[PDB]
Design a protein around this ligand. Structure first.
Ligand SMILES: [Zn+2]
Ligand SMILES: [Zn+2]
Length: 258
């Protein structure tokens, strides 16, 4: 019926409604660190988030999104493998039922507890919807989360989850600074790929940071209490909202570091 992460509507069935699932530039992938090519032609990333305007937090039934005002160049990504300015529209996570799984990308087959995705669209295209129809329409920063010490900057997000427990709920979520979620280092890997959830459009340039951020066990635990279902429906915990690694096919992963 509609796609999800269960046995009957899980990643393995997506191809039936979204044939691009078996495409040539599908995400995520495993990052073989010994095969990634260092490319000294890659510029350092430029993350300008001093003017970010968060608006809302929403449970959409497959994850929770923090949405920003993208009506102007307030929170932008440039540099790196990118040409042009990319505006931040929303951020969301992918996580598992246990600490040993949850991230989309893997590093030498290592899975992380979760993966944060900061989603950006190419301003030359005027709006998010036109951006997704272009091969260079989106830039997604992926950041791994390992369990260890708490991430102070993530606490504001953890505390509001109680209020958006089920699909379709939202809460005002202003004055949230996304800079509190960045690792100290901006070294990355990059490859041409796709969205990791339906419609799996091949429009993304992936920017996967090397350094994971740490979250406490208690913080990740809160993620696992959200629900996939809407209010008044049988309870289905929102966990394992990740897709298996896809074949790299004709692609090369480039590293910004050696
Ligand atoms: Zn994602
Ligand atoms: Zn596209």
């Amino acid at each position: 019926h509609h796609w999800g992460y269960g046995k009957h509507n899980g990643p393995e069935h997506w191809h039936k409604d979204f044939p691009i699932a078996k495409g040539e530039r599908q995400s995520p992938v495993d990052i073989d660190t010994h095969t990634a090519k260092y490319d000294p032609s890659l510029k350092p990333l430029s993350v300008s988030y001093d003017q970010a305007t968060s608006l809302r937090i929403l449970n959409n039934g497959h994850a929770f999104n923090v949405e920003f005002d993208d009506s102007q160049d307030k929170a932008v990504l440039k540099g790196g493998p990118l040409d042009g300015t990319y505006r931040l529209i929303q951020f969301h996570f992918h996580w598992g039922s246990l600490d040993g799984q949850g991230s989309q990308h893997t590093v030498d087959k290592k899975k992380y507890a979760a993966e944060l995705h900061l989603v950006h669209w190419n301003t030359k295209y005027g709006d998010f919807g036109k951006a997704v129809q272009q091969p260079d329409g989106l830039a997604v920063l992926g950041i791994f989360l390992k369990v260890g010490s708490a991430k102070p900057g993530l606490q504001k997000v953890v505390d509001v989850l109680d209020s958006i427990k089920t699909k379709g709920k939202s809460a005002d979520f202003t004055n949230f600074d996304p800079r509190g979620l960045l690792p100290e280092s901006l070294d990355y890997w990059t490859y041409p790929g796709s969205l990791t959830t339906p419609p799996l459009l091949e429009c993304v340039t992936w920017i996967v940071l090397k350094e994971p951020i740490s979250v406490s066990s208690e913080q990740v635990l809160k993620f696992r209490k959200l629900n996939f279902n809407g209010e008044g429906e049988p309870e289905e915990l929102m966990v394992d909202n990740w897709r298996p690694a896809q074949p790299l096919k004709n692609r090369q992963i480039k590293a910004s570091f050696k």
